[PDB]
Symmetry: C3
Subunit: 262 residues, 3 copies
Amino acid sequence: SECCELCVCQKEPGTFGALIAVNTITAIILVAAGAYMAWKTAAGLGWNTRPHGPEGPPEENWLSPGISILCGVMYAFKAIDWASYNDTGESTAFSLNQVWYSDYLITCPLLVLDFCITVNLRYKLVFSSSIACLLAIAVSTFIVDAPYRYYMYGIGLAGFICAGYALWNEINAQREKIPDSAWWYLSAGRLIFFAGWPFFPLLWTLSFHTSGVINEEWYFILHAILDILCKAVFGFFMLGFRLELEELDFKAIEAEQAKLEG
Amino acid sequence: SECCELCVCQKEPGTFGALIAVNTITAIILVAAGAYMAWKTAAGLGWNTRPHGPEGPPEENWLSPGISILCGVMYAFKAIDWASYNDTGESTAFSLNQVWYSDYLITCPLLVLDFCITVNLRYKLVFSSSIACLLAIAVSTFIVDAPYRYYMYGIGLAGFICAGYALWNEINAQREKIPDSAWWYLSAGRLIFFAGWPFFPLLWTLSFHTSGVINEEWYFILHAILDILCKAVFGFFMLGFRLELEELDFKAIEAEQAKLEG
Amino acid sequence: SECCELCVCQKEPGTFGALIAVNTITAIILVAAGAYMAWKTAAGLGWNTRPHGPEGPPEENWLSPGISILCGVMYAFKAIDWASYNDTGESTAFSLNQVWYSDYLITCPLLVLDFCITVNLRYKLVFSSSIACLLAIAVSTFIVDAPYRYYMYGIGLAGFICAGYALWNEINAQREKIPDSAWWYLSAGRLIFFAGWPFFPLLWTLSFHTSGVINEEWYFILHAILDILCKAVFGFFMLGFRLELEELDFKAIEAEQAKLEG
Ligand SMILES: *C/C=C(C)/C=C/C=C(C)/C=C/C1=C(C)CCCC1(C)C
Ligand SMILES: *C/C=C(C)/C=C/C=C(C)/C=C/C1=C(C)CCCC1(C)C
Ligand SMILES: *C/C=C(C)/C=C/C=C(C)/C=C/C1=C(C)CCCC1(C)C
Ligand SMILES: [K+]
Ligand SMILES: [K+]
Ligand SMILES: [K+]
Ligand SMILES: [K+]
Ligand SMILES: [K+]
Ligand SMILES: [K+]
Ligand SMILES: [K+]
Ligand SMILES: [K+]
Ligand SMILES: [K+]
Ligand SMILES: [K+]
Ligand SMILES: [K+]
Ligand SMILES: [K+]
Ligand SMILES: [K+]
Ligand SMILES: [K+]
Ligand SMILES: [K+]
């Protein structure tokens, strides 16, 4: 039928509790992580919350909490949607669970931008737009029928590997500048970027529409954990990196000022 | 049926004259207001149209006329759409009247940005993106079915109140800088922002889909007046503010130059 | 029926080879042109590929290759879509051939921006957003029914003529600055802009939905050539302009440095 054997549209009303629970929990996690990040950025500069200043926190210091909070709002909307599936058995009109990877568009162009701004990686906009385009091909690979979904997957994967290589090069060409104390958080966010991301593309090969190992319910459940790790946990490592840099900057400024007085 | 009792889809062909008229009138108003604003910005700097310069009017001086003109084009498209409802009785393919608050997305992210640029309010992009996201929840609250539209409304209203509080704080933390002559126009645009906006959210509670006091025809008619007051009249007050600032700046420059010669 | 007499939906499975071929060829052309442009921008500054520097190529030097490559990816997706029409006889779920001029949105706001950045034309964002809005009216004129498609066409054409006039003025008010060596490429990209663009609007008058001279198959075939000329060939002239400017800049810097040493 319209709903494939392994879809959430074949599940009966009353059997969606797991999905609502997972999505509410992830909404809370993402929103609260983003709220901690927001508090940390507002409260102060470095690890010891040094008073910001007249201009306040930079506007890019809000990109990171921003994504986490927005993804949490998205997940709350998804859980509201899943609750309609539990009752009415037929979703909402505004369902963020209908189009797969449609929310990942926004989130990704915002995260790659974050990384590229914080680490001062070059071609910030280039990278961010490339990822938006590769995550538009991702949506397509879920909607487009069999033979052509694999052709589209090929294009998307080629570009993903190309952009990944270029990104790797950029981070490794900024390693010299990045202090060793701040590199821990960077390498952790990179690890999240090079392992965690390829996971999204490989889970495709075992998905409900491709193979059929993971049914749509469980695919959705797994993409929630992956979002906690991207979005939320990526931002906590990037928040850490930022704070380390800002504490080291405070230290450097204070030392420069000591030498200025002396 | 698909069309609720109090909808424009239940109205017979030939009974849409009022809607076409209102929407054409508002199109004219918004476009002409934006054109006056455009002329004023191009012609000169302050109230006495002081010759601009080599670079010309700043690109942000076009955000304000821009929105008004675009909303007027939107309303012209809406009136064309309403004319098809008057004749064919079944709308156009490209109807800006189908999805409610879908046009408000663009207009709002552009207006909050305007305010934040002109008054130099901090977190410009943050505020603008927050409003875009809260006006995406607004569209949802019109499409999503009963129980879940109120859950979504709750999220939207929470964020609206949060962003409103934050905005209020920002404007009041910039009051010291803003000259008293320019504050008149600011307080008027703020009044339009804190009263006029909450009106949009309260009319929801009495709308065709929520309660049923205001049928979709009249809801549409009221949202046209509200757009004249937001968009058009908001920009005339903001244009006024800008011009006041620019005239005071011209005065300050001329005084500084007199002291430079002396 | 839903498909008009002169549409690609009336063509039988197996008769789409021409469309696939044209769209694959254009995909290759656009991608390869954009890749040459990308190589040229990365490799060096001017015509003689002068080593760039620490910061590398400006982020706007990627807007031009970018569009060409993205339009090539779009056309590859279109050819994949056309192959489904050749086999299944009913398109893909993600068809870039469904909505007419929907891809032109992105491409156009990116190209006008390019021109305005490279030639330092004023009102860059204004122009780019105007074109995005006029190319949203373009999509409408393909979907909206008879009487109202001509009303929308009128609005779109009025704005197109207005924006065209304003653009002409801007380029002619920057002619004095632009060196004569670089003007060749500029006038060629302008020629592509003032002739080539009006072609898009005039082909509308003879299209499958308006008149019926050009059926949708051949309209699609012609819009592919027009994209090679816009996108691809526009960027090769703009790449040329950029390179000329950069070689002249290198020359000027080297002369200034000779005088600095002397
Ligand atoms: C926070 C959101 C994330 C990390 C989403 C990432 C999405 C991708 C890395 C998409 C990957 C792809 C697919 C699974 C579909 C098409 C092929 C790829 C590789 C672009
Ligand atoms: C110029 C356009 C304007 C002023 C539109 C504003 C729209 C809102 C303030 C939306 C308000 C909300 C709803 C009516 C729906 C969801 C809840 C709110 C408060 C976000
Ligand atoms: C690279 C993409 C290009 C050059 C697309 C350009 C599209 C236009 C110039 C659209 C023109 C118009 C229509 C054919 C429909 C509505 C009326 C116009 C003039 C805006
Ligand atoms: K901070
Ligand atoms: K950042
Ligand atoms: K998300
Ligand atoms: K989804
Ligand atoms: K994050
Ligand atoms: K002005
Ligand atoms: K402004
Ligand atoms: K509007
Ligand atoms: K509407
Ligand atoms: K306005
Ligand atoms: K270059
Ligand atoms: K450029
Ligand atoms: K294209
Ligand atoms: K098309
Ligand atoms: K190009």
